[PDB]
Amino acid sequence: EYLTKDSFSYEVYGIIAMQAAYRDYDSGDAKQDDNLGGMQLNNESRIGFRGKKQFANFEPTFIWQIEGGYVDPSFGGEGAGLGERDTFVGFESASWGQVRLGRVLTPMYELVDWPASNPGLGDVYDWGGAIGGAKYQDRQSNTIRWDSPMYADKFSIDAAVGAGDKAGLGAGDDYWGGIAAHYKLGPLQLDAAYEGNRNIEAEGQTWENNTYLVGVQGWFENGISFFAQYKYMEADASNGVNEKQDAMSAGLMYTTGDWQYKLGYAANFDLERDGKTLSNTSDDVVSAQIMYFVDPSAVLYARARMNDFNEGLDGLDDAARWTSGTNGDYNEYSVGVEYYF
Amino acid sequence: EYLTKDSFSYEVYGIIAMQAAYRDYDSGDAKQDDNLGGMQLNNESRIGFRGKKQFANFEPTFIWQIEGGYVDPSFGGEGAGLGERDTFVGFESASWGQVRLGRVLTPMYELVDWPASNPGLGDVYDWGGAIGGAKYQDRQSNTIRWDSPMYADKFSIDAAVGAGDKAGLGAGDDYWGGIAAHYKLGPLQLDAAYEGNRNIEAEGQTWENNTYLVGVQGWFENGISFFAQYKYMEADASNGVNEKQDAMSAGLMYTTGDWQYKLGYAANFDLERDGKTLSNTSDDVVSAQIMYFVDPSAVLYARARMNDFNEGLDGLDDAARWTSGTNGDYNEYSVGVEYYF
Amino acid sequence: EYLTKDSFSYEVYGIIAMQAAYRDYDSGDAKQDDNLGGMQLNNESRIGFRGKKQFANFEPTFIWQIEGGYVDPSFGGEGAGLGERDTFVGFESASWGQVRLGRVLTPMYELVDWPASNPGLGDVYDWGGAIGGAKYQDRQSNTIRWDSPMYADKFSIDAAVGAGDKAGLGAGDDYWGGIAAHYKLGPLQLDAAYEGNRNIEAEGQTWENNTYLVGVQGWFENGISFFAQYKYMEADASNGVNEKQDAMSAGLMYTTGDWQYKLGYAANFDLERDGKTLSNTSDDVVSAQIMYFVDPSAVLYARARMNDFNEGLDGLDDAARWTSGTNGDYNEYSVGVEYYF
Ligand SMILES: CC(=O)N[C@@H]1[C@@H](O)[C@H](O[C@@H]2O[C@H](CO)[C@@H](O[C@@H]3O[C@H](CO)[C@@H](O[C@@H]4O[C@H](CO)[C@@H](O[C@@H]5O[C@H](CO)[C@@H](O[C@@H]6O[C@H](CO)[C@@H](O)[C@H](O)[C@H]6NC(C)=O)[C@H](O)[C@H]5NC(C)=O)[C@H](O)[C@H]4NC(C)=O)[C@H](O)[C@H]3NC(C)=O)[C@H](O)[C@H]2NC(C)=O)[C@@H](CO)O[C@H]1O
Ligand SMILES: CC(=O)N[C@@H]1[C@@H](O)[C@H](O[C@@H]2O[C@H](CO)[C@@H](O[C@@H]3O[C@H](CO)[C@@H](O[C@@H]4O[C@H](CO)[C@@H](O[C@@H]5O[C@H](CO)[C@@H](O[C@@H]6O[C@H](CO)[C@@H](O)[C@H](O)[C@H]6NC(C)=O)[C@H](O)[C@H]5NC(C)=O)[C@H](O)[C@H]4NC(C)=O)[C@H](O)[C@H]3NC(C)=O)[C@H](O)[C@H]2NC(C)=O)[C@@H](CO)O[C@H]1O
Ligand SMILES: CC(=O)N[C@@H]1[C@@H](O)[C@H](O[C@@H]2O[C@H](CO)[C@@H](O[C@@H]3O[C@H](CO)[C@@H](O[C@@H]4O[C@H](CO)[C@@H](O[C@@H]5O[C@H](CO)[C@@H](O[C@@H]6O[C@H](CO)[C@@H](O)[C@H](O)[C@H]6NC(C)=O)[C@H](O)[C@H]5NC(C)=O)[C@H](O)[C@H]4NC(C)=O)[C@H](O)[C@H]3NC(C)=O)[C@H](O)[C@H]2NC(C)=O)[C@@H](CO)O[C@H]1O
Ligand SMILES: CCCCCCCCOCCOCCOCCOCCO
Ligand SMILES: CCCCCCCCOCCOCCOCCOCCO
Ligand code: NA
Ligand code: NA
Ligand code: NA
Ligand code: NA
Ligand code: NA
Ligand code: NA
Ligand code: NA
Ligand code: NA
Ligand code: NA
Helix, strand or coil, rough: EEEEEHHHHCCCEEEEEEEEEEEEEECCCCCHHHCCCCEEEEECCCEEEEEEEEECCCCCCEEEEEEECCCEEECCCCCCCCEEEEEEEEEEEEECCEEEEEECCHHHHHHHCCCCCCCCCHHHHCCCCCCCCCCCCCEEEEEEEECCCCCCCCEEEEEEEEEECCHHHCCCCCEEEEEEEEEEEEEEEEEEEEEEEEEEEEEEEEEEEEEEEEEEEEECCEEEEEEEEEEEEEECCCCCCCEEEEEEEEEEEEEEEECCCCCEEEECCCCEEEEECCCCEEEEEEEEEEEEEEEEEEEEEEEEEEEEEECCCCCCCCCCCCCCCCCCEEEEEEEEEEEEE | EEEHHHHHHCEEEEEEEEEEEEEEEEEHHHHHHHHHCCCEEEEEEEEEEEEEEECCCCCEEEEEEEHHHHCCCCCCCCCCEEEEEEEEEEEEEEECCEEEEEECCCCHHHHHHHCCCCCCCCHHHCCCCCCCCCCCCEEEEEEEEEEECCCCCCCCEEEEEEEEECHHHHHCCCEEEEEEEEEECCCCEEEEEEEEEEEEEEEEEEEEEEEEEEEEEECCCCEEEEEEEEEEEEEEEECCCCEEEEEEEEEEEECCCEEEEEEEEEEECCCCCCCCCCCCEEEEEEEEEEEEEEEEEEEEEEEEEEEECCCCCCCCCEECCCCCCCCCCEEEEEEEEEEEE | EEHHHCCCEEEEEEECCCCCCEEEEECHHHHHHHHHHHEEECCCCCCEEEEEEEECCCCCCEEEEECCCCCCCCCCCCCEEEEEEEEEEEECCCEEEEEEEEECCCCCHHHHCCCCCCCCHHHHHCCCCCCCCCCCCEEEEEEEEEEEHHHHHCCEEEEEEEEEECCCHHHCEEEEEEEEEEEEEEEEEEEHHHHHHEEEEEECCHHHHHHHHEEEEECCCCCEEEEEEEEEEEEEEECEEEEEEEEEEEEEEEEECCCCEECCCEEECCCCEEECCCCCCCCCEEEEEEEEEEEEEEEEEEEEEEEECCCCCCCCCCEEECCCCCCCCCEEEEEEEEECC
């Protein structure tokens, strides 16, 4: 009659996240600046459901999750479906970790996002860049992913393969595979990742992409922590064209009592096409943040960033190639709250 | 091991609402009448999540809500996302009330909707009317809203500002601000509200709208209750054109035991443009309802209403201006159930 | 302070369902085969909410349900709204069963789907077929449905009427009615169903459809179970054209310990238009499945099927009529898990 935790086969969880963000654009077109700029609220709150089940006739524990999307993000309309964020089934066992099937982060993307896209470095380092094809997927459906245990309390591997965006609609045969490794060494973690995308259709060509990443994260007892990554992107099109672009991201943090101060920088360097540098195809971003640990479950923050994007390039079909710079340079001031339950 | 209310950081709530509604149109086109008319089910059921948190390092209590949309309304397809209805974060404290950020009702809209759009008066008084620009927003994202306490057990204020519809997509610089006040005087409540909309783009112009509302609600011990409102809408276009339209809504109720009888009437008067009345631009609606208090948590009702809309007008771009009358006059017979948990 | 089942006015339930499915198409176009074929994940997981309420002033118990859609099906994008699957309100009482209003299965469709579209027979027997108009609705909004009690522990009836697809958007006056009966005797159940669709607009005509179904299901104590159905579809267009097509579906199962072996076959026979057979308008499918009862709440399965579809036909507007064969023949190998809570 009285309920326990074991009375339920699911749990509801959530991340309640609201950011008030003011953007100031300098696109070269005053009307476009007025349109894209100004104050918005960016409600990234989401609700999820998850659970486990020990099946009577199978030793590896069954796991599942269904996570909703952002309920009212800036630059978007209201409402999100269930299953827009990480949404999967899987199995887990102590000696081999876990396997998930469904919609998850790629091993490469997980590292690109965290630590290296925070705070607000994502327009440059996450989905920014100028290279053709698909540098990497991000959160991707039709994926199988293995997460190894922490071998010897030090070393872990994340590996995955999946269908591409067109393949997921029965509209292509794109696919990808990726792997990441992590090694804990005193106050450091060393990171490495790879992703290969294949049969990518864009700009009248079929592309193969190969992306490589190396990184470090460090946490010291005096309150200083940091990260740094280098990311190398290569792409080859079916007409013989080769492209290369690299990038970096770094962050420095100082944590004292209930406060964290943070500086971030990321850059994409000029793209190279068939051995020739395309001028002014670089991007960078600098960001500063103060965060207050308002509760063990929540943070408040204030953030200021400046994005300086590339000046444009054409793709292999002689039309403009869309990038995160297409809408123009901008600065952003924001405040926010994130609460977890 | 055993759970209490305090074991959870959220609560699920819902409004289960189903209306069977038969419409009889007289548009002037028999096929359009057949299409728009007939029986539908209007399933306005919705599920929401809400909660609070006392952050360790901040006195004002944190609040949040994420409310789903109508799951299967008439004239619409099935399915609603989380966050389509009131969806926000905020803080509250006894001495100053509450502040919410996100998607909420405007102070004006809240009064227009309740009491004054019920029962079925909304096609005229809520989103009906012929004025250009944006008379007011309704439920709006990118909003900050303050709700005062009840000062001296008599007086309260609701105030808000927010981004407009285009601004929320990075496609404009529209915005609005509004305020409402409520004063309790014996068996009466006096209401007043304002909303100003700015930088509204429509019909080739930029518009400013100013809307004003005054109202009364009464509840007497003999079972009679009522409301009445007057609403004045003004609009000025960037080409110099001025428009004005006013409106009213009233309702009379008699409650005895488990029954409420209700009569409603609302009208929009003829629109004026640059000092000249546009003939046959008025609308009105009469509605009758019987409601049964089937449970402390639920009602059953039967409702009959007749809408007589305007005969059309052009906007400032020499094309027809859409109104709630564009689809034609209709009557509607309905029955329904609403249950709250 | 401590919670019981009665502390809540709702319950969350779910079906967690994941299928890894590899398709091999032979459409006649190698690129289309590459696009439609390959491996996808078909995540048919969904979350629902349901509950009941005994209203103080009405004897029949109030019931309601809001069921989410498939969170990430194959050939589709991520995310589902609440209310995409069976979503209704209703009342129930011991002596007369239950009545539901909202979005439910039609009586015909319920039998077509279960038992007769399993395993993977649906491309042929569910939404397959070549007949014009609307052979039947499936899961349909704007419906009222009665489910009788099990009279004398043997006999039950399902009856429903509803608005059509266009009517639900205010874009037509289509509607339907249907009924099914079930009779249980010893190890058998006998099934019969009917659906009539009216005012269906397609191919420049208005159509009336009448579909009839008879079936048997058997379950024996030695572990053998089976089903078989015959389905007869007739359609008449407003220009005088008559069409007829019939179909069947059958399955054989052997259950021993924690295993079920299953073979399925379904076929649509050649369509007849105005008394003339249209050659090569048939379809069939053969399917084999092994299922493991991995837990009382879950199954694992492996499945192989071969679809051989019709070679095409024109509708009454001299353009190709879309069928489940339009994309071409294919075979599919799959494995999956389904878990209920
Ligand atoms: C181990 C760990 O995680 N520890 C804790 C840590 O998590 C905690 O901090 C929090 O971490 C999480 C996880 O890292 C952070 O979550 C991230 O938050 C960012 C945003 O803040 C998310 O960024 C989004 O990424 C998606 C991709 O997944 C972006 O997609 C792009 O969206 C843009 C919109 O601007 C699109 O632009 C438009 O595109 C079209 C055409 O394509 C064009 O026509 C339009 O004009 C154009 N632009 C317009 C209209 O302006 C763009 O197309 C699209 N990209 C495409 C198609 O390729 C999305 O926009 C990003 N969001 C933005 C921007 O706001 C990020 O995904 C998310 N990560 C994950 C994994 O979900 C979280 O931010 C962080 N919180 C804080 C406060 O820092 C901390 C506690 O703080 O504790 C650690 O221990
Ligand atoms: C303090 C308190 O609250 N006390 C209790 C009280 O709550 C209880 O009574 C209940 O109260 C609630 C709150 O007042 C009531 O909830 C309201 O219910 C109505 C409908 O029942 C909701 O009305 C909707 O409002 C929105 C926003 O304004 C409408 O949006 C418009 O929708 C129409 C659809 O027809 C659109 O038309 C189409 O438009 C396009 C072009 O734009 C055109 O091409 C199409 O042809 C056209 N039409 C077609 C296809 O038919 C229109 O575009 C759009 N808006 C625009 C353009 O701006 C929406 O349609 C309305 N829906 C209706 C009507 O069905 C209202 O929003 C909602 N309020 C809130 C706040 O959410 C509730 O009804 C009430 N219940 C009962 C039983 O009376 C009472 C009793 O329980 O107790 C008190 O104590
Ligand atoms: C009593 C009882 O239930 N007992 C237990 C039993 O339930 C348990 O087993 C499980 O049973 C359930 C219930 O029977 C099974 O659930 C069913 O599963 C199937 C799918 O596996 C569902 O099928 C869907 O049906 C809908 C409606 O008919 C389909 O809609 C169609 O989708 C196609 C897909 O492409 C559309 O095609 C596209 O259309 C456009 C335009 O026309 C075209 O341009 C595109 O090219 C085209 N194709 C593309 C892009 O590829 C099509 O248009 C549309 N419909 C129409 C009318 O047009 C939907 O697609 C089907 N799903 C597909 C395909 O995957 C079925 O609805 C569902 N039933 C219910 C009621 O929801 C479940 O499968 C079963 N599990 C197992 C493991 O077998 C068992 C234990 O497991 O125990 C019993 O006791
Ligand atoms: C508190 C008492 C409220 C009394 C409300 C009386 C409202 C009178 O009815 C107004 C409805 O008008 C019907 C049509 O008349 C059109 C004339 O247009 C000009 C309006 O003055
Ligand atoms: C449509 C053809 C399928 C018919 C197959 C029926 C096989 C059933 O075999 C019956 C023999 O039963 C032997 C054991 O009987 C156990 C008691 O069963 C009670 C009723 O199921
Ligand atoms: Na703007
Ligand atoms: Na938004
Ligand atoms: Na992708
Ligand atoms: Na109709
Ligand atoms: Na609907
Ligand atoms: Na609006
Ligand atoms: Na494919
Ligand atoms: Na999918
Ligand atoms: Na349908």
